[PDB]
Design a protein around this ligand. Structure first.
Ligand SMILES: CCCCCCCCCCCCCCCCCC(=O)OC[C@H](COP(=O)([O-])OCC(O)COP(=O)([O-])OC[C@@H](COC(=O)CCCCCCCCCCCCCCCCC)OC(=O)CCCCCCCCCCCCCCCCC)OC(=O)CCCCCCCCCCCCCCCCC
Ligand code: BCL
Ligand SMILES: CC[C@H]1c2cc3[nH]c4c(c3C)C(=O)[C@H](C(=O)OC)c4c3nc(cc4[nH]c(cc(n2)[C@@H]1C)c(C(C)=O)c4C)[C@@H](C)[C@@H]3CCC(=O)OC/C=C(\C)CCC[C@H](C)CCC[C@H](C)CCCC(C)C
Ligand SMILES: CC[C@H]1c2cc3[nH]c4c(c3C)C(=O)[C@H](C(=O)OC)c4c3nc(cc4[nH]c(cc(n2)[C@@H]1C)c(C(C)=O)c4C)[C@@H](C)[C@@H]3CCC(=O)OC/C=C(\C)CCC[C@H](C)CCC[C@H](C)CCCC(C)C
Ligand SMILES: CCCCCCCCCCCCCCCCCC(=O)OC[C@H](COP(=O)([O-])OCC[N+](C)(C)C)OC(=O)CCCCCCCCCCCCCCCCC
Ligand SMILES: CCCCCCCCCCCCCCCCCC(=O)OC[C@H](COP(=O)([O-])OCC[N+](C)(C)C)OC(=O)CCCCCCCCCCCCCCCCC
Ligand SMILES: CCCCCCCCCCCCCCCCCC(=O)OC[C@H](COP(=O)([O-])OCC[N+](C)(C)C)OC(=O)CCCCCCCCCCCCCCCCC
Ligand SMILES: COC(C)(C)C/C=C/C(C)=C/C=C/C(C)=C/C=C/C(C)=C/C=C/C=C(C)/C=C/C=C(\C)CC/C=C(\C)CCC=C(C)C
Ligand SMILES: COC(C)(C)C/C=C/C(C)=C/C=C/C(C)=C/C=C/C(C)=C/C=C/C=C(C)/C=C/C=C(\C)CC/C=C(\C)CCC=C(C)C
Ligand SMILES: COC(C)(C)C/C=C/C(C)=C/C=C/C(C)=C/C=C/C(C)=C/C=C/C=C(C)/C=C/C=C(\C)CC/C=C(\C)CCC=C(C)C
Ligand SMILES: COC(C)(C)C/C=C/C(C)=C/C=C/C(C)=C/C=C/C(C)=C/C=C\C=C(C)\C=C\C=C(/C)CC/C=C(\C)CCC=C(C)C
Ligand SMILES: [Fe+2]
Lengths: 307, 55, 44, 281, 68, 260, 55, 55, 44, 68, 44, 48, 48
C-alpha cells in the first residue's frame, strides 16, 4: 500500500525549539523536557518548555488541591486500605450536600462540606486556567479564540456545577466527584427530568458533537489527503494559497456543492465545537428550572406521538 | 415612492430575485399549511364533509 | 441592456416566446386535469 | 459556475466505472457513475420516507417514523406498510452511502489526493451498518434496528440503552465517549489556534506555526504539530466511531445483563474481593 | 496485447466477435454487480452464523422500538 | 418558571429554541460568507464572470499583514491564475472535462496542477528558511525509523531511478519534508516525504515511474526551496499518480486492463 | 407582461430550467402525496371502497 | 410547440438524457412501490387472495 | 442564433425528432399498460 | 465474414478474445440445452393449462395402478 | 453528425442492430421465464 | 425507432453496456427481493 | 496436473466446449430437479 501519512516513517531530531519571544516573560518559561520517540511517530517529539506564570501557579495549586481533596476523601471511603482503594477506585464518590441543606454552607464535612471545599478548589483552578489561556494568547499577540472556546466549555461546566444548583436552590443538584458516581448523576438527571433525549437543546448539543466528530474526521482526512502538497502548513495556505488548498476546496465543492477556505474551515471547526457546550449549557439550565419533564414538553410541542 | 427604483442601484437584481422567489414560495407554502392544519379552512376536509365523502 | 447572462434582446425575446408557449401548454394540460378532477370529485 | 481556480483541475480521468459516460459536472457537483447511483438512491429514500409519512397518517416531520419490521417477521421481508418500507429505505440508504464513498474515491483520483476522506466515511458507513444490518442479523430480527424518525430513533436509543441497565457502564461505550469528547475538545482547540494565528490582535502581523507551537507549549507543555493535530483529529473521530460500533456489536450478542454487572469482575478479583470496607464491601 | 498462439478462435466471423464483445461488456458489469451482491450476502451470512453460535435465543433482548 | 408560557405552549424553552434557530441561521450565513473569501467571484469555463454567483454575497474585504515584511493580502480580491492553462474545451456546453492539449504533467494541469505562489522561501518565526537540507541544518539528524539516505529509489515501473542523498527537514516542526534524490545523470530532484514509502532496502515512489524522475521540476538554489518550487514539485509528483498509470506495474491494474 | 422576456437577461436559462424542473416535480409530488394522505381524494382507496376490493 | 427543439440549443443531450433516465426510473419505481404499499393494487396480494395462497 | 450546446438548428431539430419518437413510443407503451390495468382493475 | 465497421471491439487483447470464444462455445451449448429444457417445460405448462381449462377435477378417474 | 463518441452513422447502425438483437433475445428469454412462472403461479 | 441508433453517437457503447449490465443485474435482484418480501412468492420459506 | 493440457491434443477444443456447456446445464437441471423432488428443499412448494 501507499504511504497514508498516519505515522511518520522517519524521525529527525535537532536542537530543542525554545519558542517565540513576542512578549512572553522568558523567566517564567521552564526548560525543554525530554524528546519522546513514541510521540514523534505521531506528532512532535519535543516535550516542553511550559510557561509557569502567576496564573499558572494559582491554577496548578488549586487543581492539585482539588485532586488531593478528592483523593483524601476516597482514601477515607476506602478505610485507608490500598487494596480497597484500588478495588473501588471508580466507585468512590465525593457527593454534594444533601437537599435538606439547600445552598447553605452548613453541611457537615463528611456529608457535603468536603464537596464544597473541593468544588471551590476546582472553580479557582478552572477559572485561573482560563485566564492562563487568555494571557498566553495575549503574550504572543494571537487572537483570543482559545479563550472564548474555553469559555463555552466553562459555561457548560458552571451550569452543571454552580449556576443550575443555585437556580434550583440546592447543592444536591450538582455533580458528584467520582467516575461511576458522575455517570450515575448523568443517568439520574435524564431520568428525573423525563428522558432528556427530548430536550431540544440536548438534541442540538448532540447534533454539534456529532458534527464535531464528522467535521474533524473530514478536516483531518482532507489535510492528510492534501499533505502531499504541503497542506498541513495551513497558515501558509492562508497567506499564499497553494495547490493543496485549491484541491481541498475543489474536492469538497465537487462532493457536496460547497466548500470552505483554509481559514474558514477553522471557523466552522471552532463554532461546531463551541455550540456543543453552548447548547448543552442552555439545555441543562432549562431542565428543572423551566421544564420538569422533557417527554411531556415534547408531546406538547409535536415531538412525541401522544398528545 | 418615485425613487424606489433606486433600490436596484443598491441591491443586486439577480440575488434579490432568487431570494424573493424562495421567500414567496415559502410564504405561500406556510400559509397553505397553516390553513390545512386548522380543522376549518382545510378545504379538503370541508369538501369531504360537504359531500359526505368520509363514510 | 444589462446582459448578466449575455443574451441579446432578440435572443431573450425568442427564448421567452418559446418558454411561454411551453408554459401555456403545461397550464392548459393542468387546467384540463383540474376540470377532470373537479367533475369527478369537486373540492368546493 | 466555476471557482477562479477550478478550470485547470476539471480534466478527464480518475473515474472508477463508466469512463467518460458520466464524467461531467452538474453545477458544482461532479456526477460520475456513482454520483448517478447516489442521486437515485437518495431521491428514492426521501420519496419513500414521504410516502411512509403518508401511510403513517402524520405530516409533522418530527413525528414521521419508518419503523423496521416487528420481531415476528424475523430477518425476512415484511409488508411495505409494516416494515417493508423500512427495509427498502435501508437498502437505499446503504446504496446511497456506498455510492457517495465511491464517488468521493473518483473525485480523489481526479484531483490526485489521498483516499483518506472516503476511507474515513467508510467508518461511519460501517457504524450505520452495525446498527441496521450487522447487529439485527446477529440478533436475528430487523426489529432490533432503529426507526427512521427524528425523535423515534431517539426512543430506540433510549430503549436499547435501558435494556442493559445504565448503558454508561459499557466499557467500549466509555472509550467511545472519551474519544468523542476528546475529539470535540481537540477540534475546538485546533480551530481556535489556527484562527488566533491567522487573526491576531488588531494591527499586528499574521502569526506563524512557530507561534502556535509556542502558545500550546506555554499552555500545556506540549505541541503536537499541524500534521500531528490533523492526524490526531482523524484518529480520534475514527476511533470513536470504531469503538461505538464495537460497543453496539457486543451488546445483545455476547453481553445480555446490566453492564455494571460486567464491572463487578474487577471487584471480585481473588486478592481483594473479600476485604471489608469501601463501596463494594 | 501479445498475439495468441491458439488461432482457432480467429475463425469466427467478425460480427459474432462484436456480439461477443457486447455480451462481455454487459456480463462484466453484471458480474461486478453480482460480486458486490454476493459479498454482501456472504457478510450477512457470516454475521448470521456468528449469531447462531452465540446464545442469542437463550436470552434475547425485548423489542427496542414499538412494532410498526 | 415551570409551565409559565407567554402564549400557547411557547415558554422559555420555546423562546430559547426559536432564538437559537435564528442564531444558527445567522451563524451559517456568517460562516458561508467567511468561506467565500477565496475562489470568488465565480467564472465561466472560458474565464468571464458567471451570471450565477450564489445566494450568499461576497464579504467585505479583510487584510492579512503577512509576516517578515511579505506585504499584505486582501481577500476577497482580484485573483488570477497568472499562468497559461494548457487545456482545451471538450464541449461547448459547460460542466464537461477539459482535455490537456499537450503533456499534462509538463503543462501543470489536472492532478499535476500547481499554483503561481510567491517565488520566495517559506520562513519560520525567526525569519530563517523553514525547510532546509539536513546537512545545512545545525544539529539535525535521523532520530528513529529507517534512515533513507543511501537507499535506492524505485519507481512505479519497478526500476531504480536514483539514490537518496539528503533529507530536507522543516526546522520548527522537526519533521522530514523532502528527500533529495540523485538521478542517473548526476542531477538532484526533490520528492515529498508523503509520496515516498521508505522500505527496509529501497525507497518506493508509487507516483512516478523511473523515466519521469528527470521531469521533476528543479530548485534554482541547492540550499533553499521556494513555495513556487514546492508547489511545482508536489503537483508533478501527485499528477504522476494519474498520468504515469500506463507505466505502473500493478498486478491488479494489469488484470483489470486484461478485461478492459 | 410585455417586457417579462428581460428576465432572461438576468437569469440564466439553464439554471432556471433545471430549478424549475426540480421545483415542478417536487411540487407535483407534494400535492399528490397531500391528496393521498387525506382519506378522501386518496383515489386508490376511493376505488377500493367503490368496487369493494377490500373484502 | 413547434420550437421545442430549441430545448437542445440550451441543454446538452448527454446530461439531459442521464437526468431523464434517472428521473423516469425513479418515478416508475416510486409508483410501483406506492401501489405495492396499499392493500389494493398490491397485485401480489390480490393474486394471493384470489387463489387462496395466504393463510 | 443562441448557442449553449454547440448544436445547430438542423442538428437540434433532428435530435428533437428522434427524442420525440422515443417519447411517443414510451407514451404508447404506457397508455397500453394503463388500459390493461384499468380494464383489470379500474381506479376511477 | 464481412468486416465489421464498428472496430471498437478490436481493441481487446487477443487473450480476452480467446476467453470470450471459449465462454461463447460453452454458452452456446448451455443455451441450446436450456432451450430444449424450457421448451419441454412450456409443453408441460401448455398441457397443464389445458387440463386446468378442462373439468378434470369435477370428475377425475381413480388410480389406474396400485400406488407405489 | 453530433459525434460525441467518435462513432460514425454506419458504426452506430451496426452496433445498434447487434444490441437490439441481444435485447430481443433477452426479452424472449424473460418472456419464457414469465410464462413458466405464470403457469406455475399466476399473479393476475 | 428507425433513428434510435444515433443514441450510440451520444453515449459511448462499451461504457453504456457495462452500466446496463449493472442495471439489469440490480433490477433483477430488486424484483427477486420484492418477491421474497411477500408471503406468497416467498420461495425461500420452505416450512413443515 | 502438469500435462493435462495434452487432452486438448486428443479432443477438439470447440466441440468439447459445446458438449461441456450442454453437460453443465443438464447437470444443473438434474440437481435442481432432485432438490425439488425432496419435500425439504422444494422451494416451489409455497403453501399457506
Ligand atoms: C447563554 C449563553 C452563554 C454564553 C457562555 C459563553 C459562550 C462563549 C462562546 C463564544 C464562542 C466564540 C468563538 C469565536 O472565537 O468567535 C470567532 C469569531 C472571531 O472573529 P475574528 O475575525 O477572528 O476576530 C479577529 C480579532 O482580531 C481577534 O478576535 P478576538 O481575539 O478578540 O476574539 C474573538 C471574538 C469572538 O467572539 C464572538 O464573536 C462571540 C459571538 C457571539 C457568541 C455568543 C453566541 C450566543 C448564542 C446564543 C443563542 C441564543 C440561545 C438562547 O471575541 C470577542 O469579541 C468577545 C467574545 C466574548 C464571548 C462572551 C460570550 C458571552 O467571532 C466573530 O467575531 C464572528 C461571530 C459571528 C456570530 C454570528 C451570529 C449571528 C447572530 C444572529 C444573526 C441573526 C440573523 C437572522 C437570520 C435569520 C434567518 C431565519
Ligand atoms: C442516561 C444519560 C442521558 C443523557 C444525559 C446527559 C446530561 C445530564 C448531560 C448530557 C450532556 C451531553 N450529552 Mg447526553 N445523555 C444521554 C444520551 C446521549 C447520547 C446518546 C447517543 O445517547 C449522546 C451522543 C449524548 C451527548 C451529549 C453531549 C452532546 C453533551 C455533553 C457535551 C460535553 O462534552 O460534555 C462534557 C464536557 C464538559 C462537562 C465540559 C468540561 C469543561 C471543564 C472546564 C473541564 C474541567 C477539567 C478538569 C479541571 C479536569 C482537568 C484534568 C487535568 C487537565 C489532567 N448524550 C441520555 C439521554 N447528557 C450534557 C449537556 O450539555 O446536555 C444538554 C449534560 O450535562
Ligand atoms: C468546545 C467544548 C469542548 C472543550 C473545549 C476546551 N477545553 C479546554 C479548552 C477548550 C477550547 C482550553 O483552552 C483548555 C485547555 O488548556 O486545553 C488544552 C481546556 C481544557 N479542557 C480540559 C478537559 C476537558 N474538556 C472537556 C470537554 C470539552 N472541552 C468540550 C467538548 C472534558 C470533557 C468531560 O468532555 C474534559 C475533561 C482540560 C484539559 C483543560 C482545562 C484544564 C484545567 O482547567 O485545569 C485546571 C485543573 C487542574 C490543573 C487539575 C490538575 C490535577 C492534577 C495535578 C493532575
Ligand atoms: C466516521 C467519523 C464521522 C463521520 C465522517 C464522515 N461523514 C461523512 C464524511 C466523513 C469523513 C464524508 O466524506 C461525507 C460528506 O460528504 O460529508 C460532508 C459524510 C457525510 N456525513 C453525513 C452525515 C452524518 N455523519 C455522521 C457521523 C459521522 N460522520 C462520524 C461521527 C452523522 C451522525 C448522526 O453522527 C451524520 C448525520 C453526511 C453529511 C455525509 C453523507 C452524505 C450522503 O450519504 O448523502 C446521501 C444520502 C442522503 C442525501 C440521505 C437521504 C437519502 C437516503 C437514501 C435516505 C436516508 C434516510 C436515513 C436512513 C433516515 C435517518 C433519519 C434519522 C432521523 C434517523
Ligand atoms: C444543525 C441542525 C441540527 C438539527 C438536529 C437538532 C434537532 C433539534 C430540533 C428541535 C425541534 C424542536 O424542539 O421542536 C419544538 C420546536 C418549538 O416547538 P413548536 O411547537 O413551536 O414547533 C413544533 C410544531 N408542531 C407543534 C406542529 C410540531 O419546533 C421547532 O423549533 C421547529 C423544528 C422543526 C424541525 C423540522 C425538521 C425537518 C427535517 C426533515 C424531516 C425528515 C424526516
Ligand atoms: C417544493 C420544493 C421546491 C424546491 C425548489 C424551490 C425553488 C424556488 C424558486 C427559486 C427561484 O425563483 O430561483 C431559481 C434559482 C435559479 O437561479 P440561479 O441558480 O441562476 O441563481 C443565480 C445566482 N444569483 C441569482 C444569486 C446570483 O434557483 C435557486 O437558486 C433555488 C434555490 C432554492 C433554495 C431552497 C430553500 C433554501 C432555504
Ligand atoms: C456551525 C455548524 C452548523 C452545522 C449545521 C449547518 C450545516 C449545513 C450548512 C449548509 C450550507 O452551508 O449551505 C451552503 C450550500 C450552498 O451551496 P451552493 O450550491 O449554493 O454553492 C455555494 C453557495 N455560494 C456559492 C454562494 C457560496 O448549501 C448546499 O449546497 C446544500 C446543503 C444541504 C444541507
Ligand atoms: C403546501 O401547499 C400546497 C401544496 C397545499 C399548495 C401549494 C401552494 C404553492 C405555493 C404552489 C406553487 C405554485 C407555483 C408558484 C407554480 C408555478 C408554476 C410554473 C411557473 C410553472 C412553469 C411551467 C413552465 C414550463 C413547463 C415550461 C416549459 C418550456 C418548454 C418545454 C420550452 C423550453 C424551451 C426553450 C425556452 C427554447 C429556448 C429558445 C431558444 C431560442 C434557444
Ligand atoms: C406521489 O405522486 C405520484 C407519484 C403518485 C404521482 C406522480 C406525479 C408526478 C410528479 C409525475 C411526473 C410526471 C412527468 C413529469 C413525467 C414525464 C415524462 C416524460 C417527459 C417522459 C419522456 C420520455 C422520453 C423518452 C423515453 C425518450 C426516449 C428516447 C430515445 C430512446 C431515443 C434517444 C436517442 C436520440 C435522441 C438520438 C439523438 C442523436 C443524434 C445524433 C441526432
Ligand atoms: C418497485 O418496482 C418493481 C421492482 C416492483 C417493478 C419494477 C419496475 C421498473 C421501473 C422496471 C424497469 C424496467 C426497465 C426500464 C427495463 C429495461 C430493460 C432493458 C432496456 C433491457 C435491455 C437489455 C439488453 C440486452 C441484454 C442486450 C444484450 C446484447 C448482447 C448480449 C449482444 C448480442 C448477442 C447475442 C444476440 C447473442 C446471440 C446468441 C445466440 C446463441 C443466438
Ligand atoms: C492516591 O493519590 C492521591 C490520593 C494523593 C491523589 C488521588 C486523587 C484521586 C483519586 C482523584 C480522583 C478524582 C476524580 C475521580 C475526579 C472526578 C471528577 C469528575 C468526574 C467531575 C465531574 C463533574 C464536575 C463538575 C461539573 C464540577 C463543577 C464545579 C463547579 C462549577 C464549581 C462549583 C463551585 C462552588 C460550589 C464554590 C463553593 C464555594 C465557595 C467558597 C463559594
Ligand atoms: Fe487545520
Amino acid at each position: 500500500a501507499e504511504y497514508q501519512n498516519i505515522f511518520s516513517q522517519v524521525q529527525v531530531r535537532g536542537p530543542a525549539d525554545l519558542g517565540m519571544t513576542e512578549d512572553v516573560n522568558l523567566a517564567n518559561r521552564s526548560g525543554v523536557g525530554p524528546f519522546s520517540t513514541l510521540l514523534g511517530w505521531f506528532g512532535n517529539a519535543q516535550l516542553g518548555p511550559i510557561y509557569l506564570g502567576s496564573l499558572g501557579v494559582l491554577s496548578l495549586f488549586s487543581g492539585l488541591m482539588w485532586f488531593f481533596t478528592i483523593g483524601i476523601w476516597f482514601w477515607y471511603q476506602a478505610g485507608w486500605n490500598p487494596a480497597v482503594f484500588l478495588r473501588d477506585l471508580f466507585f468512590f464518590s465525593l457527593e454534594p450536600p444533601a437537599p435538606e441543606y439547600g445552598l447553605s454552607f452548613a453541611a457537615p464535612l463528611k456529608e457535603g462540606g468536603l464537596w464544597l471545599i473541593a468544588s471551590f478548589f476546582m472553580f479557582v483552578a478552572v477559572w485561573s486556567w482560563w485566564g492562563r489561556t487568555y494571557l498566553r494568547a495575549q503574550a504572543l499577540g494571537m487572537g483570543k479564540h482559545t479563550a472564548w472556546a474555553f469559555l463555552s466549555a466553562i459555561w457548560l461546566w458552571m451550569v452543571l456545577g454552580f449556576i443550575r444548583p443555585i437556580l434550583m436552590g440546592s447543592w444536591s443538584e450538582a455533580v458528584p466527584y467520582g467516575i461511576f458516581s458522575h455517570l450515575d448523576w448523568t443517568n439520574n438527571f435524564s431520568l428525573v427530568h423525563g428522558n432528556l433525549f427530548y430536550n431540544p437543546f440536548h438534541g442540538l448539543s448532540i447534533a454539534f458533537l456529532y458534527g464535531s466528530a464528522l467535521l474533524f474526521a473530514m478536516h483531518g482526512a482532507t489535510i492528510l489527503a492534501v499533505s502531499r502538497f504541503g497542506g498541513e502548513r495551513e497558515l501558509e495556505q492562508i497567506a499564499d494559497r497553494g495547490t493543496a488548498a485549491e484541491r481541498a476546496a475543489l474536492f469538497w465543492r465537487w462532493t457536496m456543492g460547497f466548500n470552505a477556505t483554509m481559514e474558514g474551515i477553522h471557523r466552522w471547526a471552532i463554532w461546531m465545537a463551541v455550540l456543543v457546550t453552548l447548547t448543552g449549557g442552555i439545555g441543562i439550565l432549562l431542565s428543572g428550572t423551566v421544564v420538569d419533564n422533557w417527554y411531556v414538553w415534547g408531546q406538547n410541542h409535536g415531538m412525541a406521538p401522544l398528545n | 415612492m418615485s425613487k424606489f427604483y433606486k433600490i436596484w442601484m443598491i441591491f443586486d437584481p439577480r440575488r434579490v430575485f432568487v431570494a424573493q422567489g424562495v421567500f414567496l414560495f415559502l410564504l405561500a407554502v406556510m400559509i397553505h399549511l397553516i390553513l390545512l392544519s386548522t380543522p376549518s379552512y382545510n378545504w379538503l376536509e370541508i369538501s369531504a364533509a360537504k359531500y359526505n365523502r368520509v363514510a | 441592456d444589462l446582459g448578466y447572462t449575455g443574451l441579446t434582446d432578440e435572443q431573450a425575446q425568442e427564448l421567452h416566446s418559446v418558454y411561454m408557449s411551453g408554459l401555456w401548454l403545461f397550464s392548459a394540460v393542468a387546467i384540463v386535469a383540474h376540470l377532470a378532477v373537479y367533475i369527478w370529485r369537486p373540492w368546493f | 459556475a466555476l471557482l477562479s481556480f477550478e478550470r485547470k483541475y476539471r480534466v478527464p480521468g480518475g473515474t472508477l466505472v463508466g469512463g467518460n459516460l458520466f464524467d461531467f459536472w452538474v453545477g458544482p457537483f461532479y456526477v460520475g457513475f456513482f454520483g448517478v447511483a447516489t442521486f437515485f438512491f437518495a431521491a428514492l429514500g426521501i420519496i419513500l420516507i414521504a410516502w411512509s409519512a403518508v401511510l403513517q397518517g402524520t405530516w409533522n416531520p418530527q413525528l414521521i417514523s419508518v419503523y423496521p419490521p416487528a420481531l415476528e417477521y424475523g430477518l425476512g421481508g415484511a409488508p411495505l406498510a409494516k416494515g417493508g418500507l423500512w427495509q427498502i429505505i435501508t437498502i437505499c440508504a446503504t446504496g446511497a452511502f456506498v455510492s457517495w464513498a465511491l464517488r468521493e474515491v473518483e473525485i480523489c483520483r481526479k484531483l490526485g489526493i489521498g483516499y483518506h476522506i472516503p476511507f474515513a466515511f467508510a467508518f461511519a458507513i460501517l457504524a450505520y451498518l452495525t446498527l441496521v444490518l450487522f447487529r439485527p442479523v446477529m440478533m436475528g430480527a430487523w426489529g432490533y434496528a432503529f426507526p427512521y424518525g427524528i425523535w423515534t430513533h431517539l426512543d430506540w436509543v433510549s430503549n436499547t440503552g435501558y435494556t442493559y441497565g445504565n448503558f454508561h457502564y459499557n466499557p467500549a461505550h466509555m472509550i467511545a465517549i472519551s474519544f468523542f469528547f476528546t475529539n470535540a475538545l481537540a477540534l475546538a482547540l485546533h480551530g481556535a489556534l489556527v484562527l488566533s494565528a491567522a487573526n491576531p490582535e488588531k494591527g499586528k502581523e499574521m502569526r506563524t506555526p512557530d507561534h502556535e507551537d509556542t502558545f500550546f507549549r506555554d499552555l500545556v507543555g506540549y505541541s503536537i504539530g499541524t500534521l500531528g493535530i490533523h492526524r490526531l483529529g482523524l484518529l480520534l473521530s475514527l476511533s470513536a466511531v470504531f469503538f461505538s460500533a464495537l460497543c453496539m456489536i457486543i451488546t445483545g450478542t455476547i453481553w445480555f445483563d446490566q453492564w455494571v454487572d460486567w464491572w463487578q469482575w474487577w471487584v471480585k478479583l481473588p486478592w481483594w474481593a473479600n476485604i471489608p470496607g469501601g463501596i463494594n464491601g | 496485447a501479445d498475439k495468441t498462439i491458439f488461432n482457432d478462435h480467429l475463425n469466427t466471423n467478425p460480427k459474432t466477435n462484436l456480439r461477443l464483445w457486447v455480451a462481455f461488456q454487459m456480463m462484466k458489469g453484471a458480474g461486478w454487480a453480482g460480486g458486490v451482491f454476493f459479498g454482501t450476502l456472504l457478510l450477512i451470512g457470516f454475521f448470521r452464523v456468528v449469531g447462531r453460535m452465540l446464545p442469542i435465543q437463550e436470552n434475547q433482548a425485548p423489542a427496542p422500538n414499538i412494532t410498526g | 418558571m415551570v409551565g409559565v408560557t407567554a402564549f400557547g405552549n411557547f415558554d422559555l424553552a420555546s423562546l430559547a429554541i426559536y432564538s437559537f434557530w435564528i442564531f444558527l441561521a445567522g451563524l451559517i450565513y456568517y460562516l458561508q460568507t467567511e468561506n467565500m473569501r477565496e475562489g470568488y467571484p465565480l467564472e465561466n469555463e472560458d474565464g468571464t464572470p458567471a451570471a450565477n454567483q450564489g445566494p450568499f454575497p461576497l464579504p467585505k474585504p479583510k487584510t492579512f499583514i503577512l509576516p517578515h515584511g511579505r506585504g499584505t493580502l486582501t481577500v476577497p480580491g482580484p485573483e488570477s491564475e497568472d499562468r497559461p492553462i494548457a487545456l482545451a474545451r471538450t464541449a461547448v456546453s459547460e460542466g464537461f472535462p477539459h482535455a490537456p492539449t499537450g503533456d499534462p504533467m509538463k503543462d501543470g494541469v489536472g492532478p499535476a496542477s500547481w499554483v503561481a505562489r510567491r517565488d520566495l522561501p517559506e520562513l519560520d518565526g525567526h525569519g530563517h528558511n523553514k525547510i532546509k537540507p539536513m546537512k545545512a541544518a545545525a544539529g539535525f539528524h535521523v532520530s528513529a525509523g529507517k534512515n533513507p539516505i543511501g537507499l535506492p529509489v524505485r519507481g512505479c515501473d519497478l526500476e531504480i531511478a536514483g539514490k537518496v542523498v539528503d533529507i530536507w527537514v522543516d526546522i520548527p516542526e522537526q519533521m522530514a519534508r523532502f528527500l533529495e534524490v540523485e538521478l542517473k545523470d548526476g542531477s538532484t530532484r526533490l520528492l515529498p516525504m508523503q509520496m515516498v514509502k521508505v522500505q527496509s532496502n529501497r525507497v518506493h515512489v508509487n507516483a512516478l515511474s523511473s523515466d519521469l524522475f528527470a521531469g521533476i521540476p528543479t530548485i534554482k538554489s541547492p540550499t533553499e526551496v521556494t513555495l513556487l518550487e514546492e508547489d511545482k514539485i508536489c503537483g508533478y509528483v501527485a499528477g504522476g499518480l494519474m498520468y504515469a498509470a500506463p507505466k505502473r506495474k500493478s498486478v491488479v491494474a494489469a488484470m483489470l486492463a486484461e478485461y478492459a
